[PDB]
Design a binder for this molecule. Sequence first.
Ligand SMILES: Nc1ncnc2c1ncn2[C@@H]1O[C@H](COP(=O)(O)OP(=O)(O)O)[C@@H](O)[C@H]1O
Ligand SMILES: Nc1ncnc2c1ncn2[C@@H]1O[C@H](COP(=O)(O)OP(=O)(O)O)[C@@H](O)[C@H]1O
Ligand SMILES: [Mg+2]
Ligand SMILES: [Mg+2]
Lengths: 443, 445
Amino acid sequence: MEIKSILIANRGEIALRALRTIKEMGKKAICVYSEADKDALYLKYADASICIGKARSSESYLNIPAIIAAAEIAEADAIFPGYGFLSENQNFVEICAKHNIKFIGPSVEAMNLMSDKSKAKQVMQRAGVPVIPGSDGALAGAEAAKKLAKEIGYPVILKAAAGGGGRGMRVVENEKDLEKAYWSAESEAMTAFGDGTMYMEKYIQNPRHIEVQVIGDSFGNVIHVGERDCSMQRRHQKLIEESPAILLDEKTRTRLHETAIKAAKAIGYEGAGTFEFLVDKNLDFYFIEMNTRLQVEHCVSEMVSGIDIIEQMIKVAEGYALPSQESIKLNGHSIECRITAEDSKTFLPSPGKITKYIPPAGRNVRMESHCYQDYSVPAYYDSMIGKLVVWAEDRNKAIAKMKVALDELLISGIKTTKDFHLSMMENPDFINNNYDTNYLARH
Amino acid sequence: NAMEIKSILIANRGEIALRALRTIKEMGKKAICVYSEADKDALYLKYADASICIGKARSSESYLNIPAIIAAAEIAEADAIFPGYGFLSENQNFVEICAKHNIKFIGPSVEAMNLMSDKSKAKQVMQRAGVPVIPGSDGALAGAEAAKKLAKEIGYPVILKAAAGGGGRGMRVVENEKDLEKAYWSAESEAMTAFGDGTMYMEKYIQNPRHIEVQVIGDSFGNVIHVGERDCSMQRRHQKLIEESPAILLDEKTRTRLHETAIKAAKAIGYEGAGTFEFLVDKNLDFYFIEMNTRLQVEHCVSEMVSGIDIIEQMIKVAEGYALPSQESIKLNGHSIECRITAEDSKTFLPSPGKITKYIPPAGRNVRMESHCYQDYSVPAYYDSMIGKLVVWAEDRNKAIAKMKVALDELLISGIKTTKDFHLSMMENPDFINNNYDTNYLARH
Ligand SMILES: Nc1ncnc2c1ncn2[C@@H]1O[C@H](COP(=O)(O)OP(=O)(O)O)[C@@H](O)[C@H]1O
Ligand SMILES: Nc1ncnc2c1ncn2[C@@H]1O[C@H](COP(=O)(O)OP(=O)(O)O)[C@@H](O)[C@H]1O
Ligand SMILES: [Mg+2]
Ligand SMILES: [Mg+2]
């Protein structure tokens, strides 16, 4: 039952985030590192750290035998996967169980139900969750796509069933463009995911991307920790997230929370997970996918809820019950800005040595970063510097706090997206909540 | 409104200047900083809307130069001054001069400040208000012979205290009559040098006391709220090193009566702005007023984390003529602890001035490091040994102690010594964990 020692099978800011909660709980925190990451701050803080191989970027971190051997030599009885890397690898999950190591996440069955995005939609339909009109599972091929697109009506979006990170999608405005887009997406999908299965849905114009954080336990209870608006996106990837999503009235908010809970219970979900929805102009909402793991932006939900999500993940893995939904109080407003080592206009990576680093601080300011003065950022591989998160009593106060915090973040030696975020905090469209997932594309 | 403040000069330095600046700017007001030449390297000067050099340095001397401070406010067109703590924050002449120059002093009236400033007269004011005080002299002692007579009357041990006293200075505990005359003159001389006023008073010396204080804020309508109580009993030289809220020593009935007493006291003196009533609590859990600080205190962040209130924000609103939130709206939750990290040796507490060659502060959920330091900053430990205040909050005391240890562990400072290891040994000290200590604990150990 009780977990005594947890190996963090990840790197960067999430490794440090996890380590803090693990050590506060009085458990051993075991870190792993490629040779390229021997300079990582969290290694100084870990109970033990194991070098798991050569840099080659993610390679060693994806080396299942090395991760397992590290857990075993360090005597870890559980593994925290974070996000990315092995967190959605079903093979890894089964191998953990084979070695009597607790995987802190959902069952391989639940993960498998939601891993093919086209099949996941069919599971959601069965469960009474609204989905976007489109293909019934995967497209057979380009001719099937042509027939269907005419039936649902343009514009449509082709999406990779094995897709993630915003890749393998193509919005198609007219039939003349369809076949070319199909093969473009299919090829990218094959290269990125080793699987070129495609599906299709209606393209919602100017949608809001609003997601519900859930956690389920071994007793079948599932709670939500509010919803997040992540509509400020470039290249279908998030830059700024916030909670609550003030776009929603309380009734729609309630319906959305309920839908997420219902969905989690229908699939026997345990652990932290997120249901992602698109919300249209008349506040209709549609499931687009579930992430069966923690997400990068989770801290915004922690700030409004008072919950340590990683603590609850660990407790659930130990067989404890979650708190009751009634005990969960959502208050105020949280915003997160992802600070990356990239130019604030071009968003091109800016690798190099940080020669000055002064993070912001203050009341209800949480800078989540593994960076420090003199640290070298490998922006070509991980451009993440840190997540700057604030909380305040309402959205306007949160924006003002973010502006001060961004102003006080002093980084020299590399370019960062600090100025991008500062310009967003002053942008009347952001202030008035008049934007959507395509806002940056047309500005 | 007509009283809305647009620009605030921060008449202070160090960590409190940065703390104030953050709130002022978040409220959309201009933050004007001042600095002596020795403080040209201060971090908050980078963040200020404007920064004025007010003098060579001496130490506090330029910061204590009223004409220089007023002139800086006027050149910068500040309409209000935030005094922080120390320096001019309890200087009644400065408060009156602000009013003469049509600059709003963010703090109480000079009348309320004057009622409390002489600690012996303050006790008489409190008695009249129905607030319990420690038995002792009725106002100031006439001299050493009066002290001898009184000490037999109230009973040994007694403590001689400077009426103008502060910062733990000008006090002597007297356990027997043979020691009294010498102690009297030692305190009186120290008080004369430190405060320019050797007026002494006496009260009973409470055995093994706990120091528990109540944060209040009053507005111009006569409303006064409290923001909970803080236990600050882990002291060296009668000065605080660790503070927390709530004070788990107290049961609910006593805590309620303590909060009420502070509100009653503040209303009786017409107090507006932030202030703190300091009490000692004895072995029977009876509490007694010892003094009021008519200003913000160093450890205010402790009360912010349990209450969700920005105290400096409320001070500013009150100064603009707004009403405070209702007491009903103030919810006190969880437990917060603050450790004062200074540039001193953890064992000897001797200053360790010098350049910080590495600085990595802790962070994380509900961890607040209040510091103006940065890598390459030189700490003048001889003058201000403060590095920063590390504050954490959690759902209960043991969880807060666990979070404090993790945060202290992750604080990396090189180039100077700090009291980090002292605080780590306090978080691991079973007497601390078990709540079995008092203001003299460190002296016995
Ligand atoms: N049907 C759709 N209509 C409009 N935009 C969409 C649609 N599906 C996805 N998107 C855009 O792509 C983003 C991510 O989609 P998702 O299906 O979650 O992809 P991934 O698995 O790569 O994260 C959404 O936030 C939205 O910006
Ligand atoms: N009557 C007393 N009995 C015991 N200790 C006292 C008494 N008065 C003061 N002290 C000690 O001195 C500390 C500060 O007292 P205070 O009167 O607030 O001095 P200051 O004005 O210097 O802050 C207390 O926290 C306590 O440790
Ligand atoms: Mg997605
Ligand atoms: Mg005092």
